[PDB]
Design a protein around this nucleic acid. Structure first.
Ligand SMILES: Cc1cn([C@H]2C[C@H](O)[C@@H](COP(=O)(O)OP(=O)(O)OP(=O)(O)O)O2)c(=O)[nH]c1=O
Lengths: 253, 430, 249, 248
DNA sequence: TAAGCAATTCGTAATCATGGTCATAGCT
DNA sequence: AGCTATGACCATGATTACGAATTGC
């Protein structure tokens, strides 16, 4: 058996909201360390990775390292039936065809038990080993969603360049090259755009996916981006100190 | 002559002649090059049809001899040497063989035929007797095959491809019956049918035609070959199917009626050999299923192995109406009688389609599908009064002068859809 | 000469926002004691009954009984023009085919006119009976429930017992079970249970029922056996809006 | 080297979002008087007249007198990329066909280098008339009255007498007959000379009233058989006038 | 003054489920 | 007043329903 109670019942209503139009079938390796996910999407370029580790859970028990084949679209259609401040408990038997979700409100009078029919697939555990980077940029989340939704009206490709004094998001198009220029912050809440670097970066990416990747923006308030040469862009979100959510996307040509 | 019926068939004659000319204008615009790819395709498919022309079975059709008249004649011993006529002075169901030659046929009014024979009797039927005399014959038919397929109350497709082999090791009194022992019938495929006809003869005090064929459509016409109290037979060999498929009118085959007759008198068709000689013409001209039927009626092909209800209607005709309350009240009796007859089989319908006929003869089938399953005399009427409302008040200053109304429950559900049977609200209201 | 002054305009806006999605035309009976509405929709599955009596109107007068057929999308397009505060003055003469709405802002005195029609809705309803289970629950939760099982299937199983009541739905993506456990001032769950009753309904009408959600905060679900589910909202000091729905199998 | 720096950056945003719906390309006449535009819609009925003076541009510098053709959809999709609290620096040169924009934020600047084009210009003048009636009403109430009225028909009959301004319509259901009587920056003032009753079409007034967030109040300016002015006054920058012609 | 049921054929057209866009409002 | 939610309105294949015409027993 596997049972996992989590008090923040909104995190699964947002982790499983940033991942419903991107992918549609994944492999939840439910093991003793906690919930994982790895999935290249329906276009096989963007690598989702997700981890909710054990110590951030309210309570948690399993010993059979199971591997549930989970349909994320139907699971999001079920998790969109819960309140925001509820408490979520996951229930699974060993050779189970189904998986049970428990939504307990803190009002405690209403309790919800949903039961989801699984499937089975095998996914590539294409492991991402230890790397060292070139530039790290730590920035607000509404700002990054605003920047990408601006530059997606101008063109459909983005040059991103990072130097000692800040970052340029340069987006040419058919109607004239947009350009947005951001600098650091010295001695100031969420506004800090801390940009550290060993060597400068000019890479280039697409914008059909950075209107999907920053759908995770209610999950945090600081995103980080990481970049180097001959290594994909790393778009990292942190969750409420339970673990993290990475997206990977590669440079162009 | 010059009747209202003559007027509406005159309009229908104009329409079928208009479709004749619309076919002849599409017939002239093909060439000797348009008779190539379609002809090759339909004869490649005819090679795929005729190579697996499997006819190891022996299908028997068994008609009767003036069924609605003959079952009266087994129950009327007075006038056995007289011509009988069922129906009344509006329409005839079927008349007997002492009157077929004189013209007294089916689909003929009770005033057309009655002015041809001044010495005749026309007596309305008794529809309850025939349902029993059908089952009495079906008792005999079930013995020779359990999977017999009675189309009407008298026609009966039977498959005697298995009973004949399991008849060879029989004694000479199991294969011998008594006049109501009588003459022993042999083990041949003619003889099993002679036995069937003898049992139906001296078990219902009547006669019955028959027909042996390798297929079903051949049996339907072989049952008409030696017609009164007679029979016929074809042998299962691919040559012998061709010598009867010629020299046949297409007034005889079922599925080619009256208007598809006249739309083939244009292209010069009388026999099925001529009907075979127009492959690329009929394949391009007519519709898909119809040229399928024409290419499979050409080589004599069809059902080599034999196989619920889908509708239930009540229609009713009457004199001229011109009021407003009488239509709304007379739709209720037709809803009620159909609601009586719908529960005897216990079926839940979910569509009511009313059907109206003017005094100058136009059909108007106005349909309505609901989501509540319909069974009772008040759950129908509140689906048909809202169609009589839509088609009475669409003639805004003028009434409807109808002669026939009729309701039709349809779309009877499966086993997958009878476990979720939604109910109407008119069961609960008051 | 029907004449009706309503000093809270948002009540009429909320009523005809509730009724325009489920049914699309109505035949209002306006007589000397209030406005009544009786309408089953096209598929003849649900019924909606509505009474606003002549006491919560800030003024009402009527001299002869009127029957007023109304396209509810036309009236919901006209009544989209009042703000949330307009004193609404519905006037209508007797034998004229136009309903004169007169709004009044708190001097922006609009004056709209609508065309009526000839509609003959059925003059019959559920006779007065007694019910077995009567749950009373917060209407925000009822709307959340009826909009939280349509993501599963189009069949709801309301199973009612003494400790609580359970809603379950089973569709092609799985199944779900929401359980209401009884209470310990308008988050109050009172279950007047008699006989534990389990029934199944269509969610494509329960989602249209929950469009009268801001008309109250307390909803009474009243069930029996071989009898339609009743969902009832109470428009405060005014009257009620009831929804009857037929069950499956 | 033309430079026009405006410090309330939301002004041009509300203007161009009120213009990108109606007319497609237009001419910008750049002079010491300021920024000028007269253009017609693509159906040749409405006449857009934008006038921006040089007093409230926070820094102005225009040596020659330029004309710049722009497609307003691309210009407005650039003008959906700045917050409501930015500093606009419009720029142009004679050595280039690029209208530069810079959005300054109080540390996120936003550079844009939009393409121009070359249209065949039409300088049509407006003979100034003495108007029969000029009314001043708050901008949101007119936006509500036209939008509300658009669901009823398309033939708006604006009436005016000294006691009241009386909008009527008609349609397939019945006439929505709005009034407004004679009545504190949110008042209704009627300057009347002769009573007016004149027809217009709502499907362009709906394109007009998207300049509602510019000013708190609008002024309608009318004469008998002369095309009316609907004027939305930016405070201390200029105005934006729309001309519509009556029907029949 | 020309039936009474049933079954089937094709082409028309009604309703529905679908995602996209727009407007108005709760929240920022 | 922007962001986001979200409900009304709308395009739109598409399955499903409608209807006349035709064939039989
Ligand atoms: C053809 C036809 C038959 N019937 C009825 C009357 C018949 O008694 C019965 C059988 O139809 P059939 O068996 O074709 O006709 P029949 O048996 O009367 O004549 P024959 O033996 O020459 O075929 O069905 C009709 O009511 N209306 C019709 O149009």
């Amino acid at each position: 058996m596997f049972e996992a109670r989590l008090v923040q019942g909104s995190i699964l209503k947002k982790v499983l909201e940033a991942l419903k139009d991107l992918i549609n079938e994944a492999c939840w390796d439910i093991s003793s360390s906690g919930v994982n996910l790895q999935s290249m999407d329906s276009s096989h370029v963007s690598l989702v990775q997700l981890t909710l580790r054990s110590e951030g859970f309210d309570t948690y028990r399993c010993d059979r390292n199971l591997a549930m084949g989970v349909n994320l679209t139907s699971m999001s259609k079920i998790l969109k039936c819960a309140g925001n401040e509820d408490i979520i408990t996951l229930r699974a038997e060993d050779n189970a065809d189904t998986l049970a979700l428990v939504f307990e409100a803190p009002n405690q009078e209403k309790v919800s038990d949903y039961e989801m029919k699984l499937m089975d697939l095998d996914v590539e555990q294409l492991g991402i080993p230890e790397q060292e980077y070139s530039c790290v940029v730590k920035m607000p989340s509404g700002e990054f969603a605003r920047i990408c939704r601006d530059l997606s009206h101008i063109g459909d490709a983005v040059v991103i360049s990072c130097a000692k004094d800040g970052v340029k998001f340069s987006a040419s198009g058919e109607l004239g090259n947009g350009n947005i220029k951001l600098s650091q912050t010295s001695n100031v809440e969420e506004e800090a755009v801390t940009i550290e670097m060993n060597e400068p970066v000019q890479l280039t990416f697409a914008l059909r996916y950075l209107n999907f990747f920053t759908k995770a923006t209610p999950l945090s308030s600081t995103v980080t981006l990481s970049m180097s040469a001959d290594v994909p862009l790393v778009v990292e979100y942190k969750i409420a100190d339970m673990g993290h959510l990475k997206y990977y996307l590669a440079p162009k040509i | 002559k010059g009747s209202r019926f003559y007027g509406n068939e005159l309009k229908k004659e104009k329409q079928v002649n208009q479709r004749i000319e619309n076919m002849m204008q599409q017939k002239a615009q093909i060439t000797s090059q348009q008779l190539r790819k379609a002809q090759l395709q339909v004869d490649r498919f005819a090679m795929e049809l005729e190579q697996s022309r499997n006819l190891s079975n022996t299908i028997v059709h068994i008609d009767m001899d003036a069924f609605y008249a003959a079952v009266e004649m087994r129950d009327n011993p007075e006038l056995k040497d007289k011509p009988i006529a069922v129906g009344s002075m509006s329409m005839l169901s079927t008349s007997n063989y002492h009157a077929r030659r004189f013209g007294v046929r089916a689909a003929m009014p009770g005033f057309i035929a009655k002015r041809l024979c001044p010495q005749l009797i026309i007596v309305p039927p008794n529809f309850d007797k025939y349902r029993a005399v059908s089952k009495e014959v079906k008792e005999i038919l079930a013995d020779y095959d359990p999977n017999f397929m009675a189309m009407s109350l008298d026609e009966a497709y039977l498959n005697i491809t298995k009973h004949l082999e399991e008849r060879q090791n029989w004694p000479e009194d199991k294969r011998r019956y008594f006049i109501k022992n009588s003459v022993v019938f042999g083990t041949s495929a003619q003889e099993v049918v002679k036995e069937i006809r003898f049992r139906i003869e001296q078990k219902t005090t009547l006669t019955a035609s028959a027909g042996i064929a390798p297929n079903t459509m051949l049996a339907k016409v072989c049952s008409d070959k030696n017609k009164p109290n007679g029979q016929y037979q074809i042998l299962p060999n691919r040559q012998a199917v061709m010598d009867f498929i010629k020299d046949l009118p297409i007034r005889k085959v079922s599925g080619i009626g009256k208007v598809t007759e006249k739309m083939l008198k244009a292209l010069g068709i009388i026999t099925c050999t001529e009907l075979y000689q127009q492959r690329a013409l009929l394949s391009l001209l007519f519709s898909e299923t119809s040229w399928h039927y024409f290419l499979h009626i050409s080589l004599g092909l069809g059902s080599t192995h034999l196989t619920e209800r889908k509708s239930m209607s009540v229609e009713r005709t009457f004199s001229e109406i011109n009021k407003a309350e009488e239509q709304y009240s007379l739709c209720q009796e037709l809803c009620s009688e159909l609601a009586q007859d719908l529960q005897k089989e216990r079926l839940k319908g979910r569509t009511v389609t009313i059907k109206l006929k003017n005094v100058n003869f136009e059909v108007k089938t106005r349909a309505s599908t609901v989501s509540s399953v319909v069974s009772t005399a008040e759950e129908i009427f509140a689906i048909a009064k809202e169609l009589l409302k839509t088609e009475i008040d669409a003639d805004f200053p003028h009434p409807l002068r109808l002669r026939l109304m009729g309701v039709r429950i349809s779309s009877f559900p499966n086993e997958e859809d009878r476990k979720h049977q939604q109910r109407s609200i008119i069961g609960f209201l008051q």
